[PDB]
Structures are given as structure tokens and as C-alpha cells.
Amino acid sequence: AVQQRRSSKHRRDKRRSHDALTAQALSVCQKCGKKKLFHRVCSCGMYGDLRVKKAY
Amino acid sequence: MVSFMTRLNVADNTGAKQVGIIKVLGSTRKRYAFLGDVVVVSVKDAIPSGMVKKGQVLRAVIVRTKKGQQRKDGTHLKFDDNACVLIKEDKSPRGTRIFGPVARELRERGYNKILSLAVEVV
């Protein structure tokens, strides 16, 4: 099944309205400073005041 | 659930060893006969000294079913082979003697004759 008429530059742009991205939530790890995405462990390897990994 | 074209044993003395359902009676698309439903059948094997020859269309009352059915009281009566007795036009069997047990659920529909001739009702 093919298009019978080309979908113009107007209909296409409207479809992509819902394609925009979301800014993912960001938290600031305590025990160092940086913006780790929230509910993860930052590159410190420290999650909260507990150690779960190596230096970076 | 005895269905259309279901060969079911005969449990009387009319010499109709094998009989095949031909049209489950009672309303449109009945498509299933439980205990006590009168069906119309056709004999496909007999014995020479028998009052029904091969090919006659007759009517039958089913007594034993393999699927069985849930009774009102909660007991669930289930047999192992399907049986039918051959009736003649009001309630009365064409056979003098009935073989094997017979399910009670014929009692209220009628066929007080068929239950009486039975060895033992269940």
C-alpha cells in the first residue's frame, strides 16, 4: 500500500511534534559534586553514603 | 455430549448393536444431547433375529453418556460408554429387557417404564 499523494512538508512536520525529547531528571550526588541522573550511582562509585564501585 | 453422527451402543434387547445419531431433536441447532434428551437415530448393525433391520430410522432415549453431567445436588455422574434405548412413539421401549445401569435423570421427563425394566438405577 502506497501513498496516492505526497505528504507535504506541512503534514510531516506536524507528525513529529510528539518526537521531542525529555530532559531526564538530575540529582547532585552528595560525597562529591556532580550531576548524576537521579536514582543512580555517580561515577564516584558512591551511592548516598555507601560505596558500590571503584573510583570512576 | 453426544453429537450429530455419534455411534452409541444400544442397551436393550432389540438387537441393534450399533446405532448412529441422525438428528438431535428438540428445537433448532440443539447440537448436543445430554441425559434424557430424545434423539433420532439410525441402526447401522443388527442381528438377524431382531425386530429392527439395518437402515431403519428410529427414535432413541439416551441413558448413558461418557461425558456425564453435573447434577443439581453437586454429584457428577459420569459413565464410560454411551448407551441408548429404543422407544416407540410415546415413552415405551421397543425392548423387553434393558442391559446395564440407567441414569435417574430420565425419571422426571417420563419413561417410568424404562426405569422400571432397568437392573438398577443410579
Binding site: 548524576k36 541522573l37 536514582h39 543512580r40 550511582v41 561515577s43 551511592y47 558500590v52 564501585k53 | -
Partner: protein, 119 residues
């Protein structure tokens, strides 16, 4: 379509569980996918709880799961478990392990998670 890979058959899932529990007991940390980690945790906990009594029946029942690793072989890993890992946890009711979420992977944007176990 027709010819297709065997895929995640139930045997694949259970064998992955066995390999990962062997790996986590051997070293003490795993860096895997989150949604395999939440599934490994259950079997991990069940083993460690089944392993606090040390009769030979428990040895048989745990032999059904473990696999040998580069650090420890299976009959070495059993001794390593029952000597130091299992008795360490003998007083904790449940909660033998943790699964914490790492950053998304560059290859697939999967949710890497670390599985470990500490008192």
C-alpha cells in the same frame, strides 16, 4: 518468517541464573543488566538461606545450582560459601543482597545494574 534463533528458552534463563549466582558468590559483585539482576537476586537469596545449616542434604541441594569459575572451582566454591559467606549472614532475616542502578550503556542504552552483597 522462518529459520529463527532458539532465543531465550526457559533453559537459557535458568542457566543464566546459575552462572550469575556462581559469579556473584565467587567474587562478590556483578555488573549486569538490571532486569537480569532482579531475577538473579531471588535465586541468590534462596541459596544463601538454604546454606546456613551445612548438612549433606544442603550440600546436595546447592550442588544443583553452582558452576565453577576462574577464581574458584565448584567443590572449592562450595567450601568458600559454607565457610565464610553463609555463616556471616546467619542472623539476618532476608535482605542478603542489593541491586543498584548504574548509568545507561553506550551500546544499547540498557540500564546497567550492579549486584552485590554486604552485611
Amino acid at each position: 518468517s522462518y529459520i529463527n534463533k532458539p532465543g531465550k528458552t526457559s533453559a537459557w534463563r535458568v542457566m543464566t541464573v546459575r552462572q550469575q549466582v556462581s559469579a556473584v558468590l565467587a567474587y562478590g559483585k556483578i555488573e549486569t543488566t538490571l532486569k537480569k539482576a532482579k531475577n538473579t537476586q531471588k535465586r541468590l537469596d534462596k541459596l544463601i538461606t538454604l546454606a546456613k545449616v551445612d548438612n549433606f542434604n544442603n550440600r546436595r541441594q546447592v550442588k544443583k545450582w553452582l558452576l565453577n569459575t576462574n577464581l574458584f572451582d565448584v567443590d572449592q566454591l562450595m567450601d568458600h560459601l559454607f565457610s565464610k559467606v553463609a555463616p556471616k549472614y546467619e542472623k539476618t532475616p532476608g535482605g542478603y543482597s542489593r541491586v543498584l542502578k548504574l548509568g545507561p550503556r553506550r551500546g544499547d542504552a540498557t540500564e546497567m545494574a550492579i549486584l552485590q552483597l554486604t552485611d
